[PDB]
Each structure stands twice: as C-alpha cells, then as structure tokens.
Amino acid sequence: STVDSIQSVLTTISSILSLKREKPDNLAIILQIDFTKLKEEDSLIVVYNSLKALTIKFARLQFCFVDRNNYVLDYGSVLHKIDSLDSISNLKSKSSSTQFSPIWLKNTLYPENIHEHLGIVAVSNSNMEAKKSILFQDYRCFTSFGRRRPNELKIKVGYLNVDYSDKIDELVEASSWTFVLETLCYSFGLS
Amino acid sequence: STVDSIQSVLTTISSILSLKREKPDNLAIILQIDFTKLKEEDSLIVVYNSLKALTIKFARLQFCFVDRNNYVLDYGSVLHKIDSLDSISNLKSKSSSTQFSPIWLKNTLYPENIHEHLGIVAVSNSNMEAKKSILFQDYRCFTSFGRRRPNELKIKVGYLNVDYSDKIDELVEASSWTFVLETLCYSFGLS
C-alpha cells in the first residue's frame, strides 16, 4: 500500500510517457466502469472534466464506455457527443447487447483504417474475470506497419492481490478514476 | 534517449521495488556478459564491488556468469568464490560446454529446493537472439507455492530499438552495468 502508493505514480508516470513518445495524433479512451464500485460518485464528474480537457490537445478525441460485463454503452467523439454530465451519468441505466472488442472498436471507430498515430487507453475498475475485463483483451488489431505492438495503455483502477502477468502485459494499477484521468491530463500539459 | 534516461530510472527504481516487496531472504544474480560490448572495462570493477557489497545484506548471495552464447562460465557464492577482480576478469578467457537455463541453475543452486524467499536478477548486455539471451528464458521453474510467477528482475544493459513485449515480460532497460548494479545496492541501503 505504501508501496502501492509509490508504484502507482512511478508506473503511471512511466507508462503514460511511453504513450507520449509514439507521438499520438489522436487518442481513443475506453473506460470500463462498474458504477457500484465507485467509492464516491463525484469520481464521475472528474471523468467528464478529464475527457473534455483532453480535447484541447486532441479535438478528435474518441471514447468508448463499456459496462462491467463487457457491453458497449456508448462511443464516439468526446468533443461532440459529451455535453451533459448526464451524458456520462445516464449510461448507468442504459441497456445493450453488443459485446466489446478491439476489432469491433477498430471497425467502428476506423472503417477506412488508421493512417495517423493512435494511442489506445484502456481503463477499467471492474472485476478481473478474463471474459468481461477489457484489459484482458488483444488490442494488436491496432498494430501499425513497422511497430509489432500497438500504442496501448492499460490501467486498472483499484489495486490487485492477484498476478495476471502472463495474460495481461504491462498493466498499471492506480486507485482512482481521479488519479488516472487527472495524471493523464497533466501529462499533456493540460490544466 | 532523454526519454530513455527518464524511464531507466523510473522503471529500474520501480521494478527493483517489486523485487524488494516479496522480501527476499536471498538473491541470485545471473550476469550475462558480452565483454566486447563494454564501453570501458572499469565497468567490470563496479560489478566486482557491487557483488561483494550486496553480501552485506545477503551473505548467501549467489551469482552466475553466463557468456554471450549462453554458456555458464561460473557460479556459486559471491561471498566465498569471488576474491580477486581477476575472479570476474579471467572468465573472459574461460571455455565451457554447459548451456544455461533456469532449471539448470535451480537444480545447481538448490538441489533440495527453495524454502526461503529468493529473488532472481537477470542482467545481460548481449544481443537479443532468443536462443542466446538469458532474458528470453522461462524462470517460472522458480515459482513458489502461492505465487504464480517468480520474484524475477530482468534488466537489459544497452537500450533497444526493438519490442520483445510478447516474448519477454517487464524487461528493464538501463545503460550501464554501472547504473544497474549501483542502483541495486542503493536500493538495499547499501553504501
């Protein structure tokens, strides 16, 4: 926990720096939320602010809200599709029959493919059942010609007592949607 | 490179901290050396000092020198088997027909098994051909009951332009046998 403290920043800072060196022209943020896991819900008001904030640097900022069972709740442009906090809030009470996957996301966000530099950020606070977690998934359908892996950042909100080092790969562990998204903003010189 | 600077410390510090939280009772340091890659050979005098230094905290400190083709050059107790710097130096000119592997090392260092807490440190500056590199190997023959992976630290001396994220796993990249071993000493409160 003290050690969980230190590595959160050390690892969050370090991996976000990896995201940055590939020089993304855009970012796609997939957020998988177990709403009944939020300590305080004013953790959802930081998400909103963080998201809009990121669109100062990335106007074409893309987002995707998955639920705790891996069902897509929404997606599209943060800039144009997120006006209220209701915007984020309402999805709590939103039904869906579409399972998430990178290859869905890719097909859905980029029909004509990817020519720009894209960075993928996967953040989830839901339980680590392999079939439901977005972190456990294979984002390599996003690999560019001449990289052998994508520019993928995978963060887990809420510390783990279990090792998934074989199944997942350079996963980060922080304690808040608040530490994560905010750090992510600081990292781009954002407010 | 500036970024290679920052992540070296950030990642070295962070992963060495992981080594530390498992609370090792002992350490085994495998050092794979391409001697014709050393910029300055007084990089071999730090190895010597670093090794002896570590035996202040770990008297039962075990070491293993592999060569650039994955042949064991020597092994045993740092404390009792390393007197000269010749000790380390001579192995330059030492022949061998034993390929290295964890399972050899395990069998050789621990015939009766492992009951203590052991930390494994693999440091290599040799080229990344999978069959010759010690970092590319599977150290899980060292996993304890109730951990699902070993306490393994794998450091690569000399930065890489290539991604081996699938084959190797939470590899660290530093620039010196000097930064690495010294940091490793600082980490245990050593001089």
| Cβ neighbours for A71, distance < 8 A, ≥ 6 positions apart | A96, A97, A98, A99, A100
B21 CA to centre of own chain: 18
Phi, psi (deg, nearest 5) at residue A87: -35, -55
With residue B123 as reference, give the H or E element that holds it. Answer: strand B118-124
Q: Report the alpha-carbon distance of residue A20 to residue A189 in Å, rounded.
A: 12
Q: Report the alpha-carbon distance of residue A83 to residue B17 in Å, rounded.
A: 43
Residue pair A52/A81 in contact (Cβ under 8 Å)? The answer is no
Q: Report the alpha-carbon distance of residue B34 to residue B16 in Å, rounded.
A: 23
B18 touches chain A (CB under 8 A): yes
B102: number of Cβ within 10 Å: 20
Where do we find the tokens 């403290």? A5
B6 vs A contacts (CB less than 8 Å):
14, 17
Q: List the one residue out of A28, A62, A69, A35 whose CA is nearest residue A177.
A: A35
Q: Report the alpha-carbon distance of residue B140 to residue B112 in Å, rounded.
A: 17
Q: Report the alpha-carbon distance of residue A104 to residue B72 in Å, rounded.
A: 49
Cβ–Cβ pairs < 8 A, chains A and B:
46
Q: Report the alpha-carbon distance of residue B66 to residue B38 in Å, rounded.
A: 15
Q: A185: distance to nearest CA of chain B, Å?
A: 19
B13 vs A contacts (CB less than 8 Å):
10
Q: Report the alpha-carbon distance of residue B123 to residue B133 in Å, rounded.
A: 10
Total number of domains constituting chain A: 1
CB-count burial class (<10 Å; 0-12, 13-18, 19+) for B79: middle
B10 touches chain A (CB under 8 A): yes
Residue pair B26/B157 in contact (Cβ under 8 Å)? The answer is no
Q: List the one residue out of B44, B35, B48, B34 whose CA is nearest residue B133.
A: B34
Q: List the one residue out of B78, B185, B45, B65 whose CA is nearest residue B134.
A: B65
| A16: three-class secondary structure by DSSP | helix
Structural domain for A50, as ranges? 1-191
With residue A8 as reference, give the H or E element that holds it. Answer: helix A2-21
Chain length of chain B: 191
Measured in Å, how far apart are chain B's first and last C-alpha atoms?
Answer: 28
A166 vs B contacts (CB less than 8 Å):
148-149, 169
Q: A8: distance to nearest CA of chain B, Å?
A: 9
With residue B153 as reference, give the H or E element that holds it. Answer: strand B152-157
Phi, psi (deg, nearest 5) at residue A126: -80, 160
Residue pair B68/B33 in contact (Cβ under 8 Å)? The answer is yes
Strand residue runs (E) in B70-130? 72-77, 118-124
Q: Report the alpha-carbon distance of residue A60 to residue A56 in Å, rounded.
A: 10
With residue B64 as reference, give the H or E element that holds it. Answer: strand B62-67
Q: List the one residue out of A28, A122, A17 whose CA is nearest residue A79.
A: A28
CATH number of the domain to which A29 belongs: 3.40.50.11070
Residue pair B32/B180 in contact (Cβ under 8 Å)? The answer is no
Measured in Å, how far apart are chain A's first and last C-alpha atoms?
Answer: 28
Q: B66: distance to nearest CA of chain A, Å?
A: 26
Q: Report the alpha-carbon distance of residue B124 to residue B52 in Å, rounded.
A: 19
| Cβ neighbours for A46, distance < 8 A, ≥ 6 positions apart | A177, A178, A181, A182
DSSP state of B143: P
- DSSP lists the bridge partners of residue A173 as A156
Q: Report the alpha-carbon distance of residue B126 to residue A122 in Å, rounded.
A: 34
Phi, psi (deg, nearest 5) at residue B182: -65, -50
Residue pair B32/B134 in contact (Cβ under 8 Å)? The answer is yes
A160 touches chain B (CB under 8 A): no
> B88 in the Ramachandran plot: left (φ > 0), alpha (ψ -120 to 50) or beta?
alpha
Q: Give the tokens for residue A52.
A: 């809009």
Where do we find the tokens 């070491």? B63
Distances A55 to A27, A80, B21, B24, B144 between C-alpha atoms, Å: 9, 10, 39, 46, 47
B3 touches chain A (CB under 8 A): yes
Contact at CB, A170 and B166, closer than 8 angstroms: no
User: Resolution in A, one decimal?
Assistant: 3.2
Measure CB to CB from residue A13 to each of B10, B17, B149 and give the nearest one.
Answer: B10
Contact at CB, A17 and B6, closer than 8 angstroms: yes
Distances B117 to A173, B24, B110, B188 between C-alpha atoms, Å: 24, 5, 12, 16
Q: What is the DSSP string of B120-149?
A: EEEEE-S---TTT-STTS-GGGGPPTT-SS
Relative to beta strand A62-67, strand A72-77 is antiparallel
Q: Give the tokens for residue B120.
A: 């494994």
